[PDB]
Structures are given as C-alpha cells and as structure tokens.
Amino acid sequence: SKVSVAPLHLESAKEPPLNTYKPKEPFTATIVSVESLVGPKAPGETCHIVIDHGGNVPYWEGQSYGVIPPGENPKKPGAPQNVRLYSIASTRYGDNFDGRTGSLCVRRAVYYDPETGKEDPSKNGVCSNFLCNSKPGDKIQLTGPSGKIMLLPEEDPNATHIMIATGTGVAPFRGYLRRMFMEDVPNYRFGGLAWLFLGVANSDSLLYDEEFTSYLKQYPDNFRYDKALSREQKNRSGGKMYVQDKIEEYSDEIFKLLDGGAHIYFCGLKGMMPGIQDTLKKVAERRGESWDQKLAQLKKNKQWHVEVS
Numbered sequence: 001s002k003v004s005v006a007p008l009h010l011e012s013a014k015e016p017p018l019n020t021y022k023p024k025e026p027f028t029a030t031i032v033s034v035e036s037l038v039g040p041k042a043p044g045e046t047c048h049i050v051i052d053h054g055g056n057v058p059y060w061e062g063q064s065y066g067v068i069p070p071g072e073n074p075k076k077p078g079a080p081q082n083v084r085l086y087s088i089a090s091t092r093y094g095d096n097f098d099g100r101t102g103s104l105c106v107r108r109a110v111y112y113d114p115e116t117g118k119e120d121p122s123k124n125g126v127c128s129n130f131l132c133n134s135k136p137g138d139k140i141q142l143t144g145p146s147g148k149i150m151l152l153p154e155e156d157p158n159a160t161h162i163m164i165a166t167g168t169g170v171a172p173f174r175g176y177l178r179r180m181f182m183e184d185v186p187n188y189r190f191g192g193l194a195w196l197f198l199g200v201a202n203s204d205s206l207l208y209d210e211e212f213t214s215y216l217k218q219y220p221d222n223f224r225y226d227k228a229l230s231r232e233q234k235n236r237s238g239g240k241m242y243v244q245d246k247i248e249e250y251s252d253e254i255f256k257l258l259d260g261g262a263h264i265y266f267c268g269l270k271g272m273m274p275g276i277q278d279t280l281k282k283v284a285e286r287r288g289e290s291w292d293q294k295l296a297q298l299k300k301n302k303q304w305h306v307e308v309s
C-alpha cells in the first residue's frame with residue numbers, strides 16, 4: 001500500500017543540507033507544473049508548484065527553498081531581487097517519488113484598495129505571483145535549502161507530533177505526513193500519533209484536504225485531523241472559529257501529550273501565535289503550572305517548533 005520511492009540513498013545523509021546554493025549563484029531549476037489548490041469562494045488564490053531540481057538541491061522535510069524572482073531590486077538598481085523563502089510542501093522524494101522534484105504551496109499576494117476593492121497588480125507580491133503565473137518549462141532561480149527548526153525528529157518512530165497550521169503553513173506537514181503514511185521508507189516506520197490542526201477561511205480555502213482525509217481512513221489509530229473555518233464556523237463563545245479555538249477544545253489532551261514528550265509545531269501566520277499562547281497559558285495555569293516555565297522546558301527538551309511570519 002505504501003508508495004515506492006527512489007532513490008533510497010536520500011536516506012544516507014547524516015546531516016541536513018544547508019545553503020547548497022546561495023543567492024550569489026543560484027541553481028536554475030525548471031517548473032514541472034502549477035495548479036490552483038482552492039475553490040472559487042477562497043479569499044485568495046493558493047497554488048501548488050512542482051519544481052525539477054534534477055537531484056541537485058536535495059532537502060529534508062520541513063526545510064525551505066529560496067526563490068529569486070526576475071527583475072532588478074527596486075530599492076537597489078543594478079541588483080537582483082531579494083530571496084523569498086517558501087516552505088517545501090513535498091517529501092525529499094517529491095511528488096513524482098523520484099527525488100528530482102520539490103513542491104511549494106504559494107499564496108498569491110494581491111493588493112486591493114481598502115475602499116474601492118480595486119485590485120492593483122502593480123502592488124501585488126512579486127515572487128508569489130511570479131510563481132503562481134509560472135508554466136511548465138519556465139526557469140526559476142533556487143537557493144538553499146535552509147531551516148533546521150522544522151526538521152522532523154525521527155529518533156522515536158512512535159513519537160507524537162501535533163501540527164498546527166494556518167493557510168500555507170500546512171506545507172511542512174504535507175511533507176511530514178507523506179513520509180509517515182504514504183511513502184515506503186524502510187528506515188522510518190511511523191507508529192505514533194500525528195495530529196493536524198488546520199485553520200483557513202472557508203471550505204474552498206482548504207489545502208490538500210482529500211489527502212489528509214484519506215489518512216484518517218487508512219490510519220485511524222495514528223492520525224487525527226481537525227479544521228477551523230473562520231468564516232463558516234463559530235467557536236463556543238460565538239466568535240469566528242480559529243485554530244486557537246480548536247486547540248482550546250482539546251487543551252487537556254494536548255497538555256497531557258506535551259507532558260508525555262510530544263512535539264508541537266506551528267507554521268503559517270504569525271498572527272495565530274498570540275491567541276494560541278494565551279490558550280496554552282490558561283490551561284497550564286489552571287493545572288497550577290507556570291506557562292513561562294513550561295514553555296522554557298518544552299524548548300529545552302526540543303519539543304517546541306515554530307516557523308511563522
């Protein structure tokens with residue numbers, strides 16, 4: 001049932017690759033495909049981009065690629081554009097299971113006048129629209145990979161991993177979950193609990209939902225999946241349902257899991273963190289615990305994984 005992947009020598013590296021390519025001399029990769037991930041009612045367009053790196057820019061799950069969009073740096077004529085980082089949304093084997101491609105999950109940054117709603121493409125995000133406008137055969141300047149915070153701890157193949165995403169923050173977790181459940185990786189046989197929480201605006205904004213729903217069916221004892229749709233659902237207080245509200249609903253079980261050594265991951269919008277922190281603080285304090293001290297301990301034990309912006 002698990003999908004054969006190749007080449008298995010991608011498992012041989014003892015340390016993660018880092019900054020194999022730098023902005024001074026990027027790797028010229030090639031677009032394989034670009035597809036919209038979302039339906040018509042989604043507030044923004046999010047696309048899935050498959051990139052052929054030919055095996056020259058391997059990575060581990062949870063890392064990022066840098067992309068240098070074309071054109072001159074506007075705040076520095078003569079200079080190339082600044083790198084934009086994107087969380088890799090694929091396993092190290094990639095979506096074609098061959099170790100030649102990696103995938104990105106990209107939200108089109110688009111400017112609307114607050115009063116007249118008029119989109120203004122001159123104020124749109126350069127790299128995100130460059131990427132989602134790409135077509136098979138287009139060239140892309142790649143740097144990296146980079147990142148260590150979101151590397152998956154594999155020392156315990158029965159560990160618990162609590163994955164908290166908003167929007168494109170789901171990207172590393174798509175990679176984690178394929179490695180845990182989809183791909184035939186003989187040296188990593190996951191038998192723990194993986195728990196994905198995903199917050200998006202509405203059902204049309206969900207990302208990779210059919211893939212995650214399939215894991216529920218195939219691995220009911222090892223995978224849990226909870227969604228917060230902020231424009232379509234209300235929390236117990238009658239406000240918009242955010243992922244912090246779903247965390248609160250399970251806060252007893254989550255704290256028990258953390259106390260037992262679970263890893264917790266946060267990826268996506270930085271704006272989700274204050275509300276999430278308040279929720280965990282409330283739960284720690286009811287139990288008689290200092291959240292400041294508990295969080296410090298979680299970080300010391302390497303259980304606390306944050307990459308937001």
Ligand SMILES: Cc1cc2nc3c(=O)[nH]c(=O)nc-3n(C[C@H](O)[C@H](O)[C@H](O)COP(=O)(O)OP(=O)(O)OC[C@H]3O[C@@H](n4cnc5c(N)ncnc54)[C@H](O)[C@@H]3O)c2cc1C
Nearest residue numbers: 084085086087105106107109123124125126127128168309
């Ligand atoms: C570690 C890391 C990982 C990341 N992972 C992802 C990911 O997986 N997916 C993802 O989508 N993003 C991710 N991001 C964000 C990504 O790096 C980019 O910052 C994002 O895509 C926007 O870059 P851009 O080049 O499209 O926009 P830019 O050209 O940099 O513009 C920035 C913003 O300014 C707005 N803007 C520009 N000019 C004006 C103006 N005159 N008036 C008003 N607004 C203006 C643009 O519309 C845009 O929203 C990540 C960031 C980090 C740090």
Ligand SMILES: NC(=O)c1cccnc1
Nearest residue numbers: 087168169268307308309
């Ligand atoms: N994938 C994301 O949306 C992301 C990850 C890290 C920082 N900012 C955004």
Ligand SMILES: [Mg+2]
Nearest residue numbers: 038039203204
């Ligand atoms: Mg959909």
